[PDB]
Every structure is written in C-alpha cells, then in structure tokens.
Ligand binder design. Structure first.
Ligand code: 066
Ligand code: ARS
Ligand code: ARS
Ligand code: ARS
Ligand code: ARS
Ligand code: MG
Ligand code: ZN
Length: 336
C-alpha cells in the first residue's frame, strides 16, 4: 500500500495528515500535490477507492489501479495552468464528497459510485488549455476529428477509455460485460455533460426536477429509475467541476490565478494568430475580479442554489461560502 511517491520521509506523514480530510469539502488538494511529488490525481484516487472499498468491491488489483492512474495523470499537461491533473484530482475528491451528502444516502449503486468518480478523474485528460471554440476556429485536428461537437469532451473520454485497452492498465477487467457496458454509458454521459455549452440546458432540466422532487419521510430523495439517477449524477459531476468558488477563499483564489493564467494564454495565442481576441482572454483589458463576480452571478450561484435546493439542507454552508466569496471579489473591484 503506497504511502509516498518521493524521497521525502517527512512527506509520508504530512500526506497522511492532509488525507485525514478526504471526506471533507475543506480538503486542500494543493497540499496533497505538494506532499505526493506531484501525484495529486494518483494519490487522491487511491485514497478515495480505499475509503469506499471499491478495489475490493470490483476486484481491482491495487497494482493495476496505480499503473492506470499514474498514466492517466501523465496524460494531463503539467504546462497547462488550470486544466491539469490537480484540477482533475480536485473534481474527483469533490465528487467523492457530494456522493455522501445525506439527502442521497443509499440512492446510488456501487457501479454508479465508481462511474461517477472515474468520470471526474478522466473528465479533462489531455486538455490542451484552449477552448472548444478556439479549436473549431483554428481548424484543429481535434475539431476535424469531432465535427466541432463537444470537441474536448469527446477527446477526454476517448483518451480515458483507450488507456484501459492495455491489459496492464485494465482496472475494469473483473467487471462483467454488462457492468462494463453500463459503466461506459454512464461515464460518457457524465463527461459530455461537463461541456459548458450544455450548461444552460442542464440547469433548466435540473431546476425542473427539483420542482417535482420527492423527499421521503426519512429525508432521502426518491430517485427510483435510472433516468433520474444519471441526471443527478451528471449534475453532481458538473457541480464538482464548477466547485472552485464554493471552497474556502484561500483555495478559490489559487484556482482563480490558474484559470486566468490559462485564459490569458489563449488570448495571447489568438493575438499571435491575428485572430479576434475573446474578451475574457484578453490580459490587456479583462478584469479578473469582475470575471469571477460575473461567473458566480450568472453561472455558479444558479447551479449551486439549484443543487442546494435539491439536497436541502445539505448544501447550505456551500452557498454561504459562495456568497461570501462573491462578496470578496466584488469588494475587490475599485468601482461601486
Ligand atoms: C467547465 O469548463 C470550464 C472552462 C473554463 C472555466 C470554467 N470555470 C471557470 C472558472 C473556474 N475556476 O472554474 C473561473 N472563471 C471562469 C470564467 C471567468 C468564465 C467561465 S465561462 O463562462 O464558462 C467561459 C466563458 C468564455 C470562454 C470559456 C472557455 O474558455 N471555455 C472552454 C468554456 C469559458 C468559466 C470559469 C469551466
Ligand atoms: As496516496
Ligand atoms: As497501460
Ligand atoms: As472548467
Ligand atoms: As476567453
Ligand atoms: Mg472540461
Ligand atoms: Zn474540468
């Protein structure tokens, strides 16, 4: 059972210390990365799977698991400022937390739990650090492969599933054929749902099902068919993907630094190509602070307010943090 990936003996203890917060929204993944020799995705996934007894439940070899996860992590670009393996580790650990929210207790099968955490792990692999629209506009190889439709999201799925082809890395070897087929369908569904171009419609359909939600006597949501279960799962992974502004301000600020570095790098590439600069990618004019206020007001809060509404009162502290964070960025804009 691996306890360190480096030569620092002090790190083994520090890492296990950080990992005591595995089931908490307040886990600090930057620290995890620091104490794991930059293996946040390998280590958090190993911790999550052991925490949930998923290697035992699905007869996944620890050895095969580590090899697969190391190589998946290696397919995230460490030179991409935001969409790298630390983001993937964060989305996976955040999904692990949402899976345990009391309102959803006993709702999901082990296969659905597995699908959801694996989807989070893979959902941005081999991201080149520019948007779908930038790929479409530049006639990139990916956009020609995917006919301009959910270009990156299709690619992330293709890489994550292609890596399982080699026997040495097939973590799903001992699932049954029907299990593998259902898992693949769920993961494909979840990852494609992370495409921001689908968010307005995802949310609409979410606000819709919150309306007719049936909380049972004991306080647990009744989600009786597959259709309802995969809809909550697809929204959960989406929420996890868009969870940075709901974390402690200390963490949220570090995430903002990264996403703006990535966005402004795209702006530079656009300029360089004589392309039209996308407003929020232009380092010469865009306000980092307004960009987060708007991001929260227009995208993150409506999603989380609706999730919160669905899992009442589970997500109340998340909302308060979000609103506090929103307030902090606003207060950072020098104008009234
Ligand atoms: C889920 O996919 C993404 C991609 C990029 C950022 C985020 N989350 C954001 C973050 C974040 N920390 O998660 C921060 N700021 C954001 C700001 C300021 C804006 C947007 S946006 O309105 O979704 C937007 C507007 C215009 C272009 C693009 C783009 O490049 N892609 C690929 C979607 C994105 C998202 C985020 C999520
Ligand atoms: As670990
Ligand atoms: As392999
Ligand atoms: As994103
Ligand atoms: As942009
Ligand atoms: Mg993505
Ligand atoms: Zn993501």
């Amino acid at each position: 059972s691996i306890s360190r990936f480096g030569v620092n003996t002090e790190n083994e203890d520090h890492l296990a210390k950080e990992l005591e917060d595995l089931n908490k929204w307040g886990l600090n993944i930057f620290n995890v990365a620091g104490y794991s020799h930059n293996r946040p995705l390998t280590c958090i996934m190993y911790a999550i799977f052991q925490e949930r007894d998923l290697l035992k439940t699905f007869r996944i070899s620890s050895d095969t698991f580590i090899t697969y996860m190391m190589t998946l992590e290696d397919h995230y670009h460490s030179d991409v400022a935001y969409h790298n393996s630390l983001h993937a580790a964060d989305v996976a650990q955040s999904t692990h937390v949402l899976l345990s929210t009391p309102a959803l207790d006993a709702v999901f099968t082990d296969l659905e739990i597995l699908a959801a955490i694996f989807a989070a792990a893979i959902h941005d692999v081999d991201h080149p650090g520019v948007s779908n629209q930038f790929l479409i506009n530049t006639n990139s190889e990916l956009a020609l492969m995917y006919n301009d439709e959910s270009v990156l999201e299709n690619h992330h799925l293709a890489v994550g599933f292609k890596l399982l082809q080699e026997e040495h890395c097939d973590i799903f070897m001992n699932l049954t054929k029907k299990q593998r087929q259902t898992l693949r369908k769920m993961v494909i569904d979840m990852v494609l749902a992370t495409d921001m171009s689908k968010h307005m419609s995802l949310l609409a359909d979410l606000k819709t099902m919150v309306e007719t939600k049936k909380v049972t006597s004991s306080g647990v949501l009744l989600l009786d068919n597959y259709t309802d279960r995969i809809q909550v799962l697809r929204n959960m992974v989406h929420c996890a993907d868009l969870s940075n502004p709901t974390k402690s301000l200390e963490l949220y600020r570090q995430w903002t630094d990264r996403i703006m570095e990535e966005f402004f790098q795209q702006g530079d590439k656009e300029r360089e190509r004589g392309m039209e600069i996308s407003p929020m990618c232009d380092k010469h004019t865009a306000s980092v602070e307004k960009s987060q206020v708007g991001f929260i007001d227009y995208i993150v809060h409506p999603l989380w307010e609706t999730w919160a509404d669905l899992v009442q009162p589970d997500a109340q502290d998340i909302l308060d943090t979000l609103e506090d964070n929103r307030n902090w960025y606003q207060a950072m804009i020098p104008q009234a």
